[PDB]
Structure 1
């Protein structure tokens, strides 16, 4: 359905990411609904721009050369991709997001400075 994998295994929930990704776009009832849909466009464009700073424009799954600092989560791989759901995973990491966004941004910033002089030959 729309988000029918929202309670399933976090490994198995990532097989159907597009059905969440599809439906982010979709007088009393004048300015209010116009403001609602302009705010939806604003949120989607902010999301796509923040994904585009990281070097992941047009990609649903990436990788990036940042190391995972264990202070965020000491749990290893044998308890994360098997019997938990994305809601508890967001609830555990909810105050560790700004620093990893900043490190990801600085890694892309360092990444983008290392090809333009190798392409200058």
Structure 2
């Protein structure tokens, strides 16, 4: 159960990244003000959908903090292992919600760049590949984490402990690592755009 502690670090990472995401939404909205009107190209709905997933991620983080405290109160008593798996489910869900958010910000930047820069620059052709790659890498890890969660849950019947829980911990970690890369790419692109206008 170094796990319960690690879960806390994983959750803290996910909060760190959410703050970071929010600073990029801020950057896009500024750029968008200067380049567009808003009532067209799917931008009213973008705004509405950033808000819907932001709300969603706030709830998952709230729900996850509460489960975390619970797990911390339960290290000595035994009858644990169930909260640990519950928590893995909670972090996975947070990661997915944040993936919906990156995909949105990613779309936003593509739309803006299309209008004001030649996509052909070497810097932007790498960006496009790196985005496509990290996005595939992330879905793969999510797909794989989903498969493991179900396996872990089914094996909590008579398991008596598992590497399944440790494999899953790894999975969630590697997904977050990947989101960070994607997060760095989106910050680079806003910086290119902002340098072009502002």
Question: What is the TM-score of this pair, normalised by structure 1?
Answer: 0.35
| Greater per-residue helix proportion | 2
Using the size of structure 2 for normalisation, the TM-score is 0.24
